[PDB]
Symmetry: D2
Subunit: 461 residues, 4 copies
C-alpha cells in the first residue's frame, strides 16, 4: 500500500523498468559502485533530498544510492525533463518521487515541497543532491532549520555551483558542498559531449528540420557551447559563435568557427540599431548556452530570419526573452514543447502566416524538453561522481561538528583527482579501451605514481 508519490501514469512502470535494465548495461562506472560499496553500506542512515531531471539515467542514480543504504525523496529540477516511464518505475519500487513531464510552475514548486515534507512535517533529511540549486535555495530560505541536520550538498551543474559560490562568498551557505560539475568526468563529458549528442537530437525530434547547409548562431562557447556547436557542425550546419570571453572565442576560431556578435561593435546598448540585422536575418537556428540572462533578447528575436528555430540548452529559460514573446506575439502550439510564435501580433494569427519563429520547450532546457537529455553512457560519469560525492560528505558528518569546527570545514570543493580518474577508468573500460600501465622508470621520469594521479590539480585537459 505505497502511496507516497505522484507521477503521470504509474502503469508506465514496466516500460520504465525495461529501459532501466538497459541503462544499467550502459553505466558501468555507476553499476561498479553498487558492487564495490554494497557490502559496506556507506549510505546506511543517509536521508537524501534529491532534485534533478527524473530521467531513466537518474533512475539508475537513485537505485544506486538506495542500494548503498540511502533513503531518498525525489523531484525533477525542470518542468519538462521528466521521462514519465522513469518516474513510474521509481514510484513502483516504493521510492517517493514527485515528477511528471509538463508540470506547471506551481506543480514544480509543489513537487519539491513533497520531498521536503513527509506527512506534513519536515523530513529528517541529512543530505541534499541538487541540479541547478532550486532545492538548495528553498532550504536556505524557507526551511533553514533543516540545514542544521544536513551534512552536505552535492551540486550537479554550473549554474547551481555559481549559486553556491555566491552564498559561500556572502557567508550564507550553511553546509558544505561538493561541486560535482567540475570533475573532468562531468564537466568535460556531460556538459560538452552530452550536449553534442542531445542538442541535434532534440531539434530533430521537435522539428524534423534538415540541419545540413543551414546557418546557426550559438551564443556561448564554454563546455555546453562547445558541445552544442559540434552537435550542429557535425550535421553540416554553418555555425557562428558569439562569446563575451576572449579565450573561449579564441578556441572557437581555432575550432573552425566564425566568431560574431549580435551587436555592432559588440556593444549591447538595447536599441534595434545595435542589432547586426544582416547577420540575424540569415540565421536559421539560434541556441543559447550561457547560463546568463537575456542573451537572445527581444531585438534579436525581432531581427531573426523568418521561420528560424530558437532554443536554449542552458539551465534556465531566461536566456531567451520569452516574456517579450508572450506579451507581444501569438503562440500556436504545433505539438507539446513546439510552438510557432507569430510576429504579426498578439490578436490571433493567420494559420498560413509566414512570419513566425519556432520555439522549442518554451525556452527550457531543449535536450531534456524535446528529447531525453544526455545518454546513459555519458550520465554514467556524472552520476558516478554524484554517488562518490554523497559518500564523501556523508562520511564526514559535518552536521555533528561544533560551530567553530564547522566554520573550518565549510567549503565548496571538487572531488579529488584520484576519484575523477577512477570514474574515468571505468568509463574507458566500458568502451573496451585499454589504458597502458607506466613502468616504474617511466613513473619516476615524469614524477607520478604508477597508480596516479597522473596530473597536477592545475591541469586543464
Amino acid at each position: 500500500g505505497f502511496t507516497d508519490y505522484k507521477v503521470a501514469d504509474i502503469t508506465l512502470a514496466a516500460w520504465g523498468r525495461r529501459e532501466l535494465i538497459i541503462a544499467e548495461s550502459e553505466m558501468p562506472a555507476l553499476m561498479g559502485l553498487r558492487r564495490k560499496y554494497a557490502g559496506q553500506q556507506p549510505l546506511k542512515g543517509a536521508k537524501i533530498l534529491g532534485c534533478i531531471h527524473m530521467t531513466i539515467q537518474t533512475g539508475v542514480l537513485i537505485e544506486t544510492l538506495v542500494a548503498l543504504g540511502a533513503e531518498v525523496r525525489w523531484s525533477s529540477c525542470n518542468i519538462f525533463s521528466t521521462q514519465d516511464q522513469a518516474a513510474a518505475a521509481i514510484a513502483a519500487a516504493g521510492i517517493p518521487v514527485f515528477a511528471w513531464k509538463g508540470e506547471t510552475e506551481e506543480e514544480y514548486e509543489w513537487c519539491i515541497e513533497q520531498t521536503i515534507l513527509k506527512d506534513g512535517q519536515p523530513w529528517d533529511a541529512n543530505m541534499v543532491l541538487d541540479d541547478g540549486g532550486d532545492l538548495t535555495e528553498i532550504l536556505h530560505k524557507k526551511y533553514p532549520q533543516m540545514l542544521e541536520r544536513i551534512h552536505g550538498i552535492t551540486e550537479e551543474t554550473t549554474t547551481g555551483v555559481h549559486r553556491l559560490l555566491d552564498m559561500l562568498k556572502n557567508g550564507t551557505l550553511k553546509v558544505p558542498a561538493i561541486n560535482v560539475n567540475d570533475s573532468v568526468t562531468k564537466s568535460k563529458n556531460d556538459n560538452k559531449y552530452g550536449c553534442r549528442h542531445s542538442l541535434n537530437d532534440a531539434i530533430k525530434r521537435g522539428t524534423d528540420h534538415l540541419l545540413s547547409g543551414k546557418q546557426a548562431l550559438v551564443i556561448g562557447y564554454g563546455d555546453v557551447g562547445k558541445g552544442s556547436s559540434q552537435s550542429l557542425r557535425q550535421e553540416g550546419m554553418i555555425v557562428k559563435v558569439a562569446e563575451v570571453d576572449p579565450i573561449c572565442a579564441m578556441q572557437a576560431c581555432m575550432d573552425g568557427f566564425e566568431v560574431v556578435s549580435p551587436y555592432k561593435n559588440g556593444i549591447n546598448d538595447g536599441t534595434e540599431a545595435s542589432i547586426d540585422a544582416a547577420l540575424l536575418g540569415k540565421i536559421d537556428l539560434i541556441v543559447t548556452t550561457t547560463g546568463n540572462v537575456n542573451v537572445c533578447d527581444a531585438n534579436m528575436l525581432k531581427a531573426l530570419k523568418k521561420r528560424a528555430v530558437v532554443c536554449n540548452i542552458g539551465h534556465f529559460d531566461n536566456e531567451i526573452d520569452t516574456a517579450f514573446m508572450r506579451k507581444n506575439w501569438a503562440w500556436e502550439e504545433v505539438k507539446p514543447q513546439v510552438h510557432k510564435i507569430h510576429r504579426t501580433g498578439k490578436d490571433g494569427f493567420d494559420a498560413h502566416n509566414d512570419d513566425y519563429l519556432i520555439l522549442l520547450a518554451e525556452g527550457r532546457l531543449v535536450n531534456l524538453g524535446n528529447a531525453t537529455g544526455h545518454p546513459s553512457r555519458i550520465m554514467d560519469g556524472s552520476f558516478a561522481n554524484q554517488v562518490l560525492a554523497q559518500i564523501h560528505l556523508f562520511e564526514q558528518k559535518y552536521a555533528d561538528l561544533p560551530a567553530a569546527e564547522k566554520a573550518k570545514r565549510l567549503s565548496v570543493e571538487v572531488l579529488p583527482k584520484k576519484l575523477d580518474e577512477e570514474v574515468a577508468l571505468e568509463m574507458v573500460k566500458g568502451f573496451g579501451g585499454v589504458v597502458t600501465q607506466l613502468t616504474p622508470k617511466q613513473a619516476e621520469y615524469i614524477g607520478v605514481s604508477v597508480e596516479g594521479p597522473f596530473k597536477p590539480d592545475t591541469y586543464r585537459y
Copy 2:
C-alpha cells in the same frame, strides 16, 4: 658589417628571412600589438636576455619585439633540427647575436648555448632567461651558477621545461623565479594543441609525401600535443588509435571518436617481447609519440611494427623513441635530410630494395620543426605575446636586487594573471576578424564578473 658576434649557416639568406619576417608580422597581431603598446615606454631597457628556443621565423618576430622594447639578447635554438636558416640569417644581419643553424651536431648544439652565455670568453652580464625545454636553465644552474645571482627570472615555454623547473623548486635548487608560459590558455590550449594539428601532418607530408587517408595510425599520448596530433591525422582520413596512461585523457579520446589501445597486452609493459600486442602493431602504418616521457615507443614495439611504417616524435626530446636501439642494431639509409629508412635486416649494409624497413623522421627529434617549420605564425602569436609579457613582469620585479626576505616570497614558478591571458586572446580573435560581445552591466552582475573581465575563475579549464 663589423658585427661578427654570431654563427649561422649562411648570412646571405638574410634578405629572404626579412621578407618572411615582414609577412609573419602581419600574422602576429598580439605580438605586434605589444610592440606598439610598449615601444615608447621601453619596459625592457637594460634587460639582457639569454634566449634558447627554436630559431624560426616566429622566434624572429619574438626576438625583434624584445629588442624593440629595449632588451639586448643572445640567442640559440633549443633543438638541433628546428632552426630556419633564413630566420637565423635575418636576426644576425640585424646585429643580434644568434648561434643556430639547421642540422647541428650535439656538440655544436652545446657550443651554441655556451656562445650565448659567454661573450669574449667570459660570462655575459645576463639578467633574464627565456628558455624552451630547460636545457639553458640547466646549464646555468650546473655550470654557471654565479651568473644566476644577477638574473631576475626565467620565462619557460614548454611542458617539459616547466616540469624540470617544478622539480628544482621542490628540491630547493631553483635559484631564480620563473613564469610558466606554457600554461597560459593562449599557449597550452592554442600552441600545444592546435599548433600540432597544423604542423604534424605538414611534416609527415614534407618528409614522405605519403597518403595518410585510409591508413592506420597509433598516437602515444592524449594530452594537449596528443589531442592536436590525433586530430592532425584524423582530419586527413587516418584511422587513429590512441594510447594513454591517464584514464581521464583516455576517456576524452573515446568521446572524441578514437579507439583506445595499448601496445602491450592488457596494458602491462613487462619488458618482454611476449608482452607486445604484435597483431595490433603489425597493422600500424604510422606511430607518433606525444608524451614528454621516456621510451614510449620501445625496442620491442619497433621490432613488431608493420613493414614500412613511419615513426616520429613530436614531444620535446628524442628519447620518447628507442632510437639508440635502432642505431645499435639496424642499418640507416638516408633518404634525404631528416628522413631515414631503418633496415631491420641487420647492422652492416642493406639491400637497396629491402622491404623490411621503417621510415624515421628527424632522427626522432620534434618532427614538426625537424621536417617542416613548426607551428604557424598566427598560433605562435599567442605563445610569444605571453613570453613578452612574462619577460616584462619578471624584469620589472627585479628579483636579483630584492632583499632576502622578499626573494623568498617571490621564488616561485607561476603563470601570468588571467586578465593578461584574456588580453592576448582578444587580440588573436580580432586577428581572425572575430567580434567579442561586451556584457551589459546587468549581465556582468548576473554572472558575477566585471564587464572588463576576467570572465572565469582561475580554476576554469576551458
Copy 3:
C-alpha cells in the same frame, strides 16, 4: 461531407498533421515552386494516380501537389512502419483516399494496397502509378494486368524498385514505361545519401538513446545509402568499419577514412560458422545493412555479434537481416514499439535480466522511417519535385493510347533530362539562400555549354 473512402489510425490527428504540412511546405521550395508554376495549367487534369509510398508528412506535400495540379489519387504506404499517423489523417481529412497507418500487419499492408486499386469493389480506372520499391507495380502486373492496359507509366522512387523494373524490362514482362526517379542526381545523391546521414543516427537515438561516440559500428554496403549511413555514424564519433562487395565503392570507403573489413575470414562466405570473423563481430556495437541485397547480416553473424549490439536495416526490405532465424530460435522481448531485445539464450521465454541479447530496430524494416520520421522535408523536396515532373511527363506522353507497334518502341525505363535535374537543384540551392553564379557568354563558350545549362554531359558522375 460524408467522406468515408479511407482507413487511418486516428482521424482526429488531422489538425496536427495539417500544422506539420504547413511547416513542411516552407521546407520544400522546389516542390512548392512546381505547385505554383503548374497549378493554373492543370497538367495532371484527368490523371488518376495509384500511389504507394511511405505515408509521411513529406509524402503529404507530394500528394497535395499532384492534386493541386489536377490529379485524383488513391494512396497507400509502401512499408508497414513508415506512416506518420498525423500525415495520413490530414490527407484523409482533405477528402483524399488513403489507406495507411503505423504498425500494419502484412495482411493489412496488402489490404491497403488493394484498397487503392479497387474503388467500390471494382478496379479503379487508374492511368498512372507512383511507386517506392515496386510492390504496387508487382501486384498490378501479377494480379491486375488488365488495369495496366490503361496506365500511361510508372514513376519509381527507389533503387530496389528500379532494379525490379529493369528485371521486368529484360524479361519482357514490363507492361508500361517507367521513369527512374531514383537516378536524378537531386534524388540519388541527395535523398539516398544525405537523407540517411540525417535520419539513421536520428532513428537509433529515438529507439535506444544510446551514446554512439566511441563505440564500434559495422556498415554493410557503401553505395549511396551506405555512404550516408557511414557518415551519420562517423560524425557522431563512432569508429566505423565498412563492408563491400564492390571494389570501387570499397576504394571510396578507404579514401573517406574508413577501415574496410568483411564479416567473413578473407571475405569468403562459405555458409559455416567457421568462416565468421568472430573476433571482429565480437567487437561490434552496431551493425547497419544498406545493400538492397539478401542475407547480408546472416544467422552466423547474428550469433557472433557482441552482446547487446544494436542491429538495424536501412535498405528497402527486411530480408537484408536474417530475422526469420531470430524468430525461429530466440525469444523476443518488446522494449517499446519497434524496439525488441532478442535473447540468444533460447526460444522459450527469457530471463528479464539476461545479458546476452541483441537490440533489433523496427523488426529489421527500414529503420529511419520505422524508428524516426525518415528523411527531412528539405531533402525530400528534391525527390518529390522529380516525382511531379516525372508524373507530368509520362501522363502527357499518353503511352496507353498508342498502337501496339508504337508501344513496343516507347517501352523503356528512363531518367528525367538533366536540364530538369538542374532546375530542381537550383530551387534547392535557393532554399538554403545559396547564390549560383551565371557564366559570361565567353566563359560558356570556353567550356562548351549554354549559359543556361545543361552544364555537364550525361556521363558526368558528380
Copy 4:
C-alpha cells in the same frame, strides 16, 4: 654515354631513385600491372611521346611502360611541376626526359619539341600519353604527318578530355583516345582525394599560414572543387563555395558549405559595381578549381581582402587574371613560386606595404607548383589506368586499319568497368581492406556475376 636528356641536376638521381623505390611500395595497382604484363611485353614496339608532370609518381609510370616493352620520350606538362630528382633518376636510367622545375614558357615548348624530334627529325612515335592536351595540340597543328603513324592518345585530365571532345565534335581529331580521367579510380580518386591531400599541403609549404579559423572561397565544386573544399574545411577554414552548376551547388550546401557568388545576384556585368565587395573583403584565401577562364577576375582581385592568398588548382593559369596583375601591380618574389603582388601600383613597391595579395605558383597548378602534387598511393589508380589504356590502344593498331574500320574506332572512350574495378581492388588491398565475395544466391539476387562488374555503366558512385 647517354646524353639524350635535359634536367636541372643529374647528380640528384640517387635521391630520385631512393624515392622511386619508396613510391613503388605505395603503388600496388601500377606495380601489379608491371609484374603482370612483364612476361607478355604488350608494349614491345610502342614508341610513346609522354607529356605529364615529371614527378616521382610519373617516374614509376614511365618505368612501368618501359618494363612492358615501350620506348618513350618524355616532358612535363607544366613549367613548375617537375621534381628535379625524379627527372634526374629517369635520365640516369637512360630514358629521354626534358624537364625541370621552373622552366620558362619558351623552354616548356622546347622540351616538348625535344620529345617529338630525335636527331632533328620527327621520331617514329606511334603512341601519345598526355595530360592537358598540349602535346596532342602540337602534334595536330605542327606535326600532323606524325599522327599518320600514331595508334592513339591516352589523356589524363578533365581539361585535356574536353579538348579531345571538341576536336572530335569538329572533325579535327586524327587518332582515337582513351579518356583516362573518367575511370572512377581516376576521377573520383585523383581529382577529388588527390586535391584533398595536396592543396593544403602546397599552401602550407608556400606560406606556412595558419588556415584554421580563416575565410576561404573555393570557385567550383566539381571533383577538384570538392576535394579542395575538403582540404581547407578539414583544417578548420570557414569555406564558401561558388558554382555555376546548380547540382554541384546543391552538393556543396548538403556538404555543409555556404554557396555564394563573387557577383551580386550571381550576375557579372563586367563592372566593379557587380562585385560583392563586402564578401570579397572578408576572404583570406581564394582557390580556383574550374577548368574555365577568368573565374578570379581583375575586379575580384581588386576587391579581395588585403594580404589574401590567391591560387589555382585547375589545369591552366588563365583561371586567374594574372595578366591584369602583371600589367598593373608590382611583383615581389618572396621565394620561388611565391610572389607578393602590391596593389599600390606598377613601378616599384614599399617593402612594408600592407596592400598586397600573395600569389602561389604564378597562378599555375598550385599543388604541383608549391608542393609535390598528389601522393603515390592516389596516383597509383590514375597511372594503372594509363598503362591499361596504352596497352588497349597500342594493341588495337588504329594506324594500320583500313579507312572504314578507322571510322568505326575514331572515338574518345573510357576503359571498361571491369578494369576500373580490378584497379580499385588492388588499391583496397594496399590499405589492407578486405572485400567480401558475393554468394551465388546473392549474386543471382542482385543480378551480377560474383566477379563483377557490380554496377551498370550508368552508376555514378
